[PDB]
Design a protein around this ligand. Structure first.
Ligand SMILES: Cc1cc2nc3c(=O)[nH]c(=O)nc-3n(C[C@H](O)[C@H](O)[C@H](O)COP(=O)(O)O)c2cc1C
Ligand SMILES: C=C(C(=O)O)c1ccccc1
Length: 369
């Protein structure tokens, strides 16, 4: 199998195995995608699959300013322009449907409320907010409140409506954001979950919310249009788990039963070392993948974090992964697919323009002649 040949992720046909990883860029004021956002995604539509920037299912699920959501009619319309443009260029795109949990600020929440989380443990994290006068500012994340059972039910309904909104906006499917210390991970990992009900304690209880989200989304749009992103060891957003292997092997054993389109795995610390660990034992990614396959899992296995041309080619041809998602390289190389096919040089990403601002460092990276 070649990185450059087509693949199938559930119901979604991919023209190649080069995936655009989800990338928050904070360029959608009012939580509504705009015409500049459409240019940005259309420039990258030769990707076998685009995963959008995280897109919240609700205002409660927002944690950063100027992030596009799926909870306004105007936002659905803005996304429809994007998916139509990507499709006209021959591409495929899934929405990364998001709930940040405790990684938020009161100024972003409905009613000025506390962010919600499995347990009321404040993150040592920072976010991007807008003041009353319209000025932007960095802020420490706010003190969260612990979710009630009824609150959890309401969030599940928000995942249902968000998945439905994604289909209405023309997406080929969704990627459930269950990575990088956000709400689902807060339930999964030990440092954030001190609950004493059916959603805390045991591995089965800590995985319960994740699997309820998956089953809610899959029932709404079809398991063949549902994928999920996982990040077993990442330290993102102040989260810690000492024993990820039994936890995550259990999670994917259960996901292997659900006929999902794809599993997207961050290998290591997100944006940092691939060999990162938090606990005493290194994580075994082969054992993790085998737990999924041995349970019947047939989703496309998409790997991320620190790949380059040679390692991506080797990982697919060896059968370790089915596809490779690139993040920073897609920021800087709209025609990454052609550059990799031809072994052409890549543009370097400009970190200062990753977040916020306008076209500079967003739509003005050049393609090849
Ligand atoms: C600017 C930026 C924004 C990101 N936004 C998201 C996001 O919205 N969702 C997500 O799951 N990961 C997000 N990530 C992580 C990337 O998807 C990816 O895992 C990371 O960049 C490592 O891959 P790479 O080595 O190919 O860059 C972001 C990373 C960067 C650099
Ligand atoms: C959605 C993100 C993630 O998953 O880490 C994110 C958010 C803000 C900046 C970078 C990344």
């Amino acid at each position: 199998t070649s990185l450059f040949e087509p693949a199938q992720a559930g119901d979604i046909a991919l023209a190649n195995r080069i995936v655009m990883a989800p990338l928050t860029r904070n360029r959608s004021p009012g939580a509504i995608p705009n015409n500049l956002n459409a240019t940005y995604y259309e420039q990258r539509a030769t990707a076998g699959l685009i995963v959008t920037e995280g897109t919240p299912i609700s205002q409660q699920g927002q944690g950063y300013a100027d992030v596009p959501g799926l909870y306004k009619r105007e936002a659905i319309e803005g996304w429809k322009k994007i998916t139509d443009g990507v499709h006209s260029a021959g591409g495929k795109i899934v929405a990364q449907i998001w709930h940040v949990g405790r990684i938020s600020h009161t100024s972003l929440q409905p009613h000025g409320g506390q962010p919600v989380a499995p347990s009321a443990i404040t993150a040592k994290s920072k976010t991007y907010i807008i003041n009353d006068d319209g000025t932007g500012a960095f802020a420490e994340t706010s003190e969260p409140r612990a979710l009630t059972i009824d609150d959890i039910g309401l969030i599940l309904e928000d995942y249902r409506s968000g998945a439905r909104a994604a289909l209405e906006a023309g997406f080929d499917g969704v990627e459930i954001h269950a990575a990088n210390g956000y709400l689902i991970e807060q339930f999964l990992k030990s440092s954030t979950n001190q609950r004493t009900d059916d959603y805390g304690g045991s591995i089965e209880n800590r995985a319960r919310f994740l699997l309820e989200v998956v089953d809610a989304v899959a029932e709404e749009i079809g398991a063949g249009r549902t994928g999920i992103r996982l990040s077993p060891v990442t330290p993102a957003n102040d989260i810690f788990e000492a024993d990820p292997q039994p936890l995550y092997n259990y999670v994917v054993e259960q996901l292997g039963k659900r006929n999902l389109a794809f599993i997207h795995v961050v290998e290591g610390a997100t944006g940092g070392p691939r060999d990162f660990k938090q606990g005493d034992k290194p994580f075994d990614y082969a054992s993790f993948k085998a737990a999924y396959r041995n349970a019947g899992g047939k989703g496309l296995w998409i790997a991320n974090n620190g790949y380059d041309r040679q390692s991506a080619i080797e990982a697919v041809e060896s059968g370790k992964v089915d596809a490779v998602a690139f993040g920073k390289a897609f920021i800087a190389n709209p025609d990454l697919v052609r550059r990799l096919k031809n072994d052409a040089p890549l543009n370097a990403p400009n970190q200062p323009t990753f977040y916020g601002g306008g076209a500079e460092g967003y739509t003005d990276y050049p393609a090849l002649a």
